[PDB]
Amino acid sequence: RVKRGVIARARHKKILKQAKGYYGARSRVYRVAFQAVIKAGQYAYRDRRQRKRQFRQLWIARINAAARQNGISYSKFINGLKKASVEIDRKILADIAVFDKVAFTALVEKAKAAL
């Protein structure tokens, strides 16, 4: 009796339409959805965030690569940046001492000094 309405036949859509990176099926069909996207929302339910503290392997494992060229490295390279000056955080840093033959030394001579 009650005409289905904007529910069902309105559910096949509003879904399937969001997978800009769909697959063969899992987008053309619905029975392939709500099971392919069910993994979505989860699988990494609230984890992308993994990268941070994950791929961050470098930036703290390249800092020595930046150094070990104009003196010591990692060991007493970060144990000097917090000694003098305002002490700059290590984010954009330890990532710039690779894509530019400059600034990387603007931290080595900073360190090794006032040690």
Added chain:
Amino acid sequence: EVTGSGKKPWRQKGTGRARSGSIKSPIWRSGGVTFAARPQDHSQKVNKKMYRGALKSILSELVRQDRLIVVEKFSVEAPKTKLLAQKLKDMALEDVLIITGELDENLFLAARNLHKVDVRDATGIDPVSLIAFDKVVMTADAVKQVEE
């Protein structure tokens, strides 16, 4: 009442059958509700005193200033409807159409057209007609009949 064995040959089990319509059978539209307590359809956790008590409290809502007003019995006589709109205008309560309307004796037809008017008699007036959207208006004989 069960049907027992007989009638038409075919393996079938005990199932609610009312006018060839299934009921009281949990696994069928309008069937037994195993999880009892709430034998009906979605209402609200809720009367003997709220329904009736209100049926009384409402009758008291009339004796309030910012409310309705009692009209003489001659009101039921008015055959036309325009006369009502007038008696409601001069009454300074033409905005009562924005409310509703009632009376006594028989159903006052001559007002069943006026804005918001669910005609009803003082005899059987559930809290409903008593005040459409917490507001109303009645007549003389009506009040007396409602008193009891």
Added chain:
RNA sequence: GCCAUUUAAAGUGGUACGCGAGCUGGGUUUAGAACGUCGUGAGACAGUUCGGUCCCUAUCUGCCGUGGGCGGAGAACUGAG
């Protein structure tokens, strides 16, 4: 397993006791019947015996062979493995 005539030798074990979408069916677990045993009995008895059906135009994959193209083509050759 009785056994016969030969054989210089004429071992053994696994492959879901390899192998029935390859075969054969002769055997066992159907409708008849015969027999013993059990039963009063129908009938019964992983007791026996005579007669008794075992299917499919493989799509994919694998392998055995044969070709078309791709690295511009005809002809003649070489050739790791």
Added chain:
RNA sequence: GGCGUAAUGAUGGCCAGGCUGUCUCCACCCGAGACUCAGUGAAAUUGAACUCGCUGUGAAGAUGCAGUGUACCCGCGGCAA
């Protein structure tokens, strides 16, 4: 019901003569086709992905687990794991 028994019985087992592929092993041919071409044109059958190989492991013989290596595309025919 025991014993035994002419003629007959598409009944069960067995031996001889003659003969025969039934077998030890097997060539082609004939009719109607298969392979290709015009026209006419269904029905069965599929969770997804899918070209693996060598070892190891696993209920100790899985392509799909683990470690490496490797893997050109398509198509025709078969015997079919």
Added chain:
RNA sequence: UGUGCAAACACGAAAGUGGACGUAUACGGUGUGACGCCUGCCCGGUGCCGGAAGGUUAAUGGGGUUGCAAAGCUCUCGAA
């Protein structure tokens, strides 16, 4: 093996009916099942049938007890 028949035997709730448009050199109910040789030991334990001292075998009526009635208890007498 049963039966001379309004029989045995069988069918139907009943009314009626099959076998009888028959009748025992009949018909119904069964075993064996040909032909040939045949054919020996026991009835202690079923079914059917016949006879049968004694034992077993209801209720009514009858007798005794019980109770100014009645329950109840009990005796006696018993076809096929």
Added chain:
RNA sequence: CGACACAGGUGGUCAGGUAGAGAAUACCAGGCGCUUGAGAGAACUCGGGUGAAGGAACUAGGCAAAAUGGUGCCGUAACU
């Protein structure tokens, strides 16, 4: 008739049309071509016709196949 223009099933009469041992093959009369096509000398069956030598050795069983298999004369056992 069988769901269909399904090689299934379905009564009677014509059994002297011509050649032989006959209502058997070939052939007048009569009827019909209404049981999808075209090209190439594979592997690959079902149907089919038998093989040099041996010959059932196959096999549950010679299943299958084959063989004797017209007519006339001679001759013909056990058993009953």
Added chain:
RNA sequence: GCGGAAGAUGUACGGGGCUAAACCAUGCACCGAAGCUGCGGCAGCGACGUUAUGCGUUGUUGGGUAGGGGAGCGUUCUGUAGCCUGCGAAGGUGUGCUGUGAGGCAUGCUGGAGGUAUCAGAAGUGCGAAUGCUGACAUAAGUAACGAUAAAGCGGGUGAAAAGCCCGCUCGCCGGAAGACCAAGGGUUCCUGUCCAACGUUAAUCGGGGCAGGGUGAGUCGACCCUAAGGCGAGGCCGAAA
């Protein structure tokens, strides 16, 4: 540490490879968890204050199948207030924005007739997973199949087309039979003319196909009539009666 130790299409610790880039006895610094600590955003329970389960502060802070509890939005119709619309709505497609979400909302195209918000009540209310029910559809396949009455062929005619419509010749099949006459049954399917969209497992100017007409004129043919096994109705007799 070793002898006691033979078997399966190419053999090695994950590999390279390492006298330690092994192993054994220890130790230190790092990478490395959604771990621990720090910055911006929670839940449940309990405590304090409170009418409050509203806030503020405080202790514990946050994995989960079966199962328990709770919130939620899509939805229809009928209240009361109050609006939008052919300077165009609902619905549909694509897209932007917002909410933890369930969703709301906007734009463009289209549609082109009505459709909502607040508070309130309501409904047979919101759904991918019964060898589920019904209809439709894809891949599979343009793959499988057409076989004792195995006969057609060479010219010609007609036609816009003719390998199977028609003519001639030649070549064959059947003969108790595909011949002739009939029962049952089927039933006009018979004949003529005009056509073919539909039927004929190809095509067809052909048809037992489609359409329109015509055809089956008996006293002696058959029906009609009667009867056999047998059956029925009426009277007679049985709770009652078909």
Added chain:
RNA sequence: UCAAACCGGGAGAUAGCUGGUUCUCCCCGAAAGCUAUUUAGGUAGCGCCUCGUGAAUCAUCUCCGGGGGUAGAGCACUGU
């Protein structure tokens, strides 16, 4: 269609038998014993999830006042 007809009818027969049972999010988060029940893959009073009410001060991870006698040990019934 028969170790038992077909159709419809009194069946949406009865089953301690199988399967089935579809929207989002948040919090917490098992067990496999006893008595009785036509009861044992079922409930009720109870061992265990959750919610409301009621009462009231321990409990136990500790300590303190009792009961058991197993491992082990020693050496011990009995029988070697």
Added chain:
RNA sequence: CGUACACGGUGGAUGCCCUGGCAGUCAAGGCGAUGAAGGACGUGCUAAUCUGCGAUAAGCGUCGGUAAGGUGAUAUGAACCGUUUAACCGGCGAUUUCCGAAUGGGGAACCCCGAUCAUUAUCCAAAUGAGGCGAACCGGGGGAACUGAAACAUCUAAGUACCCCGAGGAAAAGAAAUCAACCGAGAUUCCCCCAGUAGCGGCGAGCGAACGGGGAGCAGCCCGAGCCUAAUCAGUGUGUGUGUUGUGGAAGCGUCUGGAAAGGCGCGCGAUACAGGGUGACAGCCCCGUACACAAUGCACAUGCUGUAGCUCGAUGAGUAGGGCGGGCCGUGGUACCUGUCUGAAUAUGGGGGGACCAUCCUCCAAGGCUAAAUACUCUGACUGACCGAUAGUGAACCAGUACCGUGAGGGAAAGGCGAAAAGAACCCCGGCGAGGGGAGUGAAAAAGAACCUGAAACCGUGUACGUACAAGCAGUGGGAGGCACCUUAUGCGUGUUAUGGCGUGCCUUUUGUAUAAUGGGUCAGCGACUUAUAUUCUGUAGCAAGGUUAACCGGGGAGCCGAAGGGAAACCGAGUCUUAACGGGCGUUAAGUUGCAGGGUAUAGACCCGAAACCCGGUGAUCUAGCCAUGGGCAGGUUGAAGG
């Protein structure tokens, strides 16, 4: 060939509409041997269906109404009729072939007659009845099972299903040898209550009244005689309240959009008449219709009246009451009712009854009979419905109970809509071609062309964006590099898509464990699975408060129920009560509940859906086949060759 989209198609969902259903309500209610219902078959110039009739065949006649238009649904061609006023609407009359329950007899519609039973009987069928049909309801008889008792033989389902006979529009019952709180009630049914009490029951499960009270409706009378006339009977006249149709009936207004408004916007109006429909798109004030008015018919239930006709006296029904035996049935208990066999009274100076038997009170008197009124269903007519909407709803809004299936009983679909009108594809080209369309035309809001509104998904074709014949697989995410393509969301800000690299074993139940060689699904949409009375026990909210709430039926009631003091077997007491000479103890007590709507749960009852074989009843069938019977037909011929003579 992967994926997205674009244009077109397939398909048909969806949105809207719907001349249909479903449900409720009021009114009304039988037909026929003067041969009906139903069916068969005719009939219109053409008509194949449906409907109407029926051979004066979708028609004839009269009266009344009505009206110019008409000749059914199909708006076609031809053509007719009407003012000698038709069509149409209502009533009535005439006619009404043959067959047909027909019954003379036979018979699958065809041929010849009152057949059969029965009454009266001038016994001549001469005069009459029965023999059929019809939705349910009603009365009198016969009478299960599965099932429940989670076994089952009582019991339960049942006195139901089904069967036999019969009446009416209504039946059955009934005037008390009753009831039995009483110096009382007092015909019988039905509704409510009394009771879920008394009672019954392996007293297990379950089963289950009545008296009375409150209502609806009220009516009492007849069988021997005497006498005389208003009960009754026979007959006559003959209604008030009506049925259908037509008459007295107001009303396009303005602007804008459009082909057209029943649009938007502005204004006004009807209402003892605030249903709905139609008219070119949502008009209560356009048309019909709704309240209303009038005339044609049927019914006329009743009453009036004529002739009959009061009234009076006595009595009152034996194989019955009752008893015994064997059963059925009931709530029926030794104390219901009825059937069958046997036995068998008295008699009102008598007898029966008051739920046990027998003597003593009260009531009432059988063994004869009749009797109005008070509810049912729903074919038919009308109305309504917060019902459904054409895979919805009745199977049927389209030929439907039709297509079609089965020997038969029986079973049983699908198919809606162009629009203002008509269009529904003219003309031209191509081609073998009325079977493949460019083009073009049709259009409104037909993002229209013969199953035509809108018109999605699965899906197909072309085309576009982008990968793509070394390529490893959930096919993401974050970081950093590449290019290409687009700048209707200008801002170092994004998309389509992709090369390469680091990771990554569909979804759903069963199970201790399932990604798993456990089970289910090819995909899609729709469909598809937790309710209607009451009773009991708790919980959340709220009014009021030892008072509270009613039920039938009335805005009135308070019956009755629960609570207020309890406890006990009871008597009985009372601060309870059991135990108890007595005493002493056990348990309970100084004020809150009741009445609904909801939320936990519980019992009686089709109370989890679908899913396997049985059982029982009434019917349909042996053109298959099995056996028998009746009537016909068939068996080239050969071989061997007895008895007998």
